[PDB]
Amino acid sequence: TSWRSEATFQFTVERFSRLSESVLSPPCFVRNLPWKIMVMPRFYQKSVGFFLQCNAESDSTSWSCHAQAVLKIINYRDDEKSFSRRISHLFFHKENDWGFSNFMAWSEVTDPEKGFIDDDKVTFEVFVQADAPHGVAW
């Protein structure tokens, strides 16, 4: 159920090579809160920005939830070549997302020989393990 303490969810970004604005997945409910994948191009050389967002729409300022997560870009040819990074973060209203602005090089993820992109689609996955929240279910 939505009260579960962990879940894995995926979001496939289409027309990936043409991405310009941040894109957001539908919510996955864990600890009864909505978690989402956020992806955007970033520049510093171009990189994939990949973030996990928690409970961002709520106007509450009382809530918090600590979670650990694995953020993964799927390699569709060989899951052993999928690329992942781990985070731990206390999510709350003023810091409702966390991840990596330079998760991977854009030129690598979009390289058709590497196995992450197919039909201009790239799939992102999050495994999130969340603690019981505070300041929500009183």
Binding site: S22, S47, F51, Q53, R85, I87, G99, F100, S101, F103
Partner: peptide, 8 residues
């Protein structure tokens, strides 16, 4: 660096 942190 992988740029760990918030999106904004």
């Amino acid at each position: 660096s992988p740029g760990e942190g918030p999106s904004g």
